[PDB]
Design a protein around this nucleic acid. Structure first.
Ligand code: ATP
Length: 367
RNA sequence: GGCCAGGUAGCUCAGUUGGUAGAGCACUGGACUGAAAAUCCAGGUGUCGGCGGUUCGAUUCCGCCCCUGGCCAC
């Protein structure tokens, strides 16, 4: 219906950005980005009116947001910078060639993909390529983004883009960049399933040393990341109904050797979840003694008492130890699963004494 | 859209090793009164946001959503 309203208004609208990429990658998303030559606001208002839904105009930015069903629509006016601006000027201000393309929703040319910079070629060649040599200088945040994309799509940086990125990092532009944008970029990074690869790229180009103060790479941490990779794989395989956010675990492994002050500060900047902060504060201190207690474990009930109050993340961190692995697993798929019939429990009930008695019965069943 | 709080009676507010809930003023009834108020005895003062899951048992553990306020990414 967009092309029709655009025809009535005598305008030109286009699907633009990653939305196109995902479309070309076969990935269907509910968030669509539009670039409109002429006023996008009235277009969004009319489209919202015909479908009979609310509209959220933003005149100063020149963009408008409206929601139809599960579809989240954003209409943006064509702008050459971050006289009417052409679509090409609006695309050339973007980061990478794969994100620089567009698909015309105009009724006459409808279905046609508009690619000026050959982003389609780079898409088929699995290449992350910047539009201009000053790209990383303009927006240092992109230094992360590229890597992030290279993590997700499993693409490779072109020689040009790679050299330019390395030069950009060597100038320490990553420190001059706004803290919030970088932190948010890392937040977007850790949400990826391929995030580990993004960490490999972060290690390769050493951006984490720039962003995080006091952070240095070693082998133990990396091996811990791959072990955690295996644990995450298994847990997301069998226990998948119990899934939690995995990236934060890797993030904890990275900051494990860091000082508690810098760790708490970083987690504060990242706006980490409560269970993440708890797992970190537990890891930095009580984790060692916990392991030492798990080493002295003989009966299964002691293992129960030491494990059950803990979260799943802590257990996954306990699976990093080879000796504790099968123990944790045994606690998972067997130990904590059990029940009791009616008459028996009725005999058990005859305050806290009922609970203590139940515990005595459980440790009576286990051992 | 991300996060942090806040959600407790009509209103204003505390509450952690899960184990049988609270304050200050409105609410009902009776004693009291010509009527009313005060006051006394008392006692509602509540599925402690909503829906699932774990647990013998969840205001608490978790997950998904509702509401309000504040930091922002926009
Ligand atoms: N710092 C930047 N510089 C230039 N162009 C950018 C920048 N950030 C975003 N863009 C462009 O604007 C679009 C905004 O899309 P969005 O913010 O959703 O990111 P994305 O690439 O779609 O990934 P995701 O959907 O995971 O956020 C992107 O497709 C990108 O082409």
């Amino acid at each position: 219906m967009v092309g029709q309203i655009a025809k009535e208004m005598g305008l030109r609208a286009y699907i633009v950005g990653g939305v196109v990429r995902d479309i070309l990658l076969g990935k269907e998303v509910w968030d669509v980005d539009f670039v409109v030559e002429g006023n996008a606001i009235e277009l969004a208002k009319e489209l919202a009116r015909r479908h009979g839904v609310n509209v959220h105009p933003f005149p100063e930015f020149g963009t408008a947001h409206l929601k139809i069903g599960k579809l989240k629509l954003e209409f943006a006016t064509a702008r050459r910078e971050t006289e009417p601006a052409s679509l090409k000027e609006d695309l050339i201000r973007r980061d990478f060639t794969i994100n620089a393309m567009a698909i015309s929703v105009n009724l006459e040319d409808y279905g046609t993909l508009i690619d000026y910079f050959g982003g389609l070629r780079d898409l088929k060649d699995k290449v992350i390529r910047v539009l201009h040599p000053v790209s990383f200088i303009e927006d240092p945040v992109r230094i992360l983004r590229a890597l992030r994309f290279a993590g997700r799509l499993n693409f490779k940086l072109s020689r040009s883009t790679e050299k330019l990125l390395k030069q950009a990092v060597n100038l320490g532009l990553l420190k001059e960049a706004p803290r919030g944008r970088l932190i948010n970029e890392i937040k977007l990074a850790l949400r990826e399933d391929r995030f580990l690869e993004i960490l490999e790229l972060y290690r390769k180009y050493r951006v984490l040393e720039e962003i995080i103060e006091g952070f240095q790479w070693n082998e133990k941490v990396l091996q811990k990341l791959y072990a955690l990779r295996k644990v995450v794989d298994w847990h997301a395989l069998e226990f998948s109904e119990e899934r939690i956010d995995y990236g934060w675990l890797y993030l904890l492994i990275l900051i494990s050797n860091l000082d508690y002050e810098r760790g708490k500060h970083f987690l504060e900047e990242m706006s980490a979840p409560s269970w993440v902060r708890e797992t970190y504060k537990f890891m930095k201190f009580k984790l060692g003694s916990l392991k030492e207690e798990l080493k002295k474990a003989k009966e299964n009930y002691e293992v129960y008492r030491l494990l059950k109050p803990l979260h799943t993340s802590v257990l996954l961190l306990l699976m990093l130890e080879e000796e504790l692995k099968e123990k944790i697993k045994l606690y998972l798929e067997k130990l904590r699963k059990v029940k009791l019939p009616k008459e028996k429990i009725e005999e058990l009930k005859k305050g806290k004494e009922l609970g203590e008695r139940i515990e005595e019965l459980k440790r009576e069943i286990m051992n």
